[PDB]
Amino acid sequence: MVNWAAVVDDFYQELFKAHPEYQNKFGFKGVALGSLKGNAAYKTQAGKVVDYINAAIGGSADAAGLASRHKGRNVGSAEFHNAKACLAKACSAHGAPDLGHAIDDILSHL
Numbered sequence: 369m370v371n372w373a374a375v376v377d378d379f380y381q382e383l384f385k386a387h388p389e390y391q392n393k394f395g396f397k398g399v400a401l402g403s404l405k406g407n408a409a410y411k412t413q414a415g416k417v418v419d420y421i422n423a424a425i426g427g428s429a430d431a432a433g434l435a436s437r438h439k440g441r442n443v444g445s446a447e448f449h450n451a452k453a454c455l456a457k458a459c460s461a462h463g464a465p466d467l468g469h470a471i472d473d474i475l476s477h478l
């Protein structure tokens with residue numbers, strides 16, 4: 369199977385390197401990037417993201433519901449366009465299929 373856990377780890381490295389302030393919205397605010405993998409909040413959140421990717425591939429993802437929850441954290445289409453780029457870099461680093469269509473599905477509700 370594609371190692372989505374590793375893809376997501378590289379995704380958050382790319383995301384928070386480019387936009388460190390986005391990290392302040394999570395339970396691992398303030399934690400050094402090189403130690404995220406040892407942080408309990410981060411392990412939980414990454415696992416949710418992996419689950420969402422597997423749901424999107426599997427055909428069960430609720431993009432509208434995810435979008436609504438992100439608006440509920442004052443996260444919008446600008447942030448998602450940045451994430452789309454970071455995720456494309458992470459997928460490429462692992463030879464994983466690009467997830468741009470899944471992110472577009474979320475964007476269509478933002």
Ligand code: HEM
Binds near residue numbers: 390395420434437
């Ligand atoms: C590839 C783009 C992204 C995907 C696939 C994604 C996915 C997810 C998922 C699956 C959850 C958990 C939702 C739930 O439990 O129902 C979540 C929560 C969250 N996301 Fe994202 N996300 C993305 C981008 C972003 C960006 C750019 C931000 C900017 C800060 C962000 C901020 C948050 C926050 C603050 C939470 C709540 C975390 C908490 O409960 O402590 N997300 N996201």
